[PDB]
């Protein structure tokens, strides 16, 4: 996903990726109070990237989700860590909730298992 750069691009520190097994549509950030303890969201702390100059600095922060069930829809979204800014204060940006479904069987492979005891 897009790299985030505040006004004074200096000291960028952190992203936060949220993912839960979801059915359809009905998913929100402020869902079933994460509060302190039992959580409604799987959460990953993503280290801020290394820019590597000004021309071609999109060394796009990312993440490899593992430990997922197959043929499963996942509600996913990213957030930039909460920054007390100099003057008109902003933490920054959050991505939209995207649903991503892990892979399932190839049709071919459903057929096989069916067609051959």
């Amino acid at each position: 996903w897009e790299p985030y750069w505040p006004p004074d691009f200096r000291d960028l520190l952190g992203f936060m990726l949220f993912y839960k097994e979801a059915p359809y549509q009905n998913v929100t950030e402020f869902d079933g109070q994460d509060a302190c303890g039992s959580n409604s969201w799987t959460v990953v702390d993503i280290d801020p990237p290394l820019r590597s100059n000004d021309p071609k600095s999109q060394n796009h922060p990312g993440w490899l989700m593992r430990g997922l069930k197959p043929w499963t829809q996942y509600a996913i979204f990213v957030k930039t860590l909460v920054t007390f800014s100099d003057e008109r204060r902003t933490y920054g940006a959050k991505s939209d909730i995207i649903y991503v479904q892990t892979d399932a069987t190839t049709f071919e492979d459903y057929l096989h298992n069916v067609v051959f005891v």
Binding site: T105, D109, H112, N113, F116, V117
Partner: peptide, 21 residues
């Protein structure tokens, strides 16, 4: 499953036989 027994796995030349219709 046969897919799970020999594709996302490896199946014994006999396991393979057994249910030959």
């Amino acid at each position: 499953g046969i897919v799970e027994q020999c594709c996302a796995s490896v199946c014994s030349l006999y396991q393979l036989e057994n249910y030959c219709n």
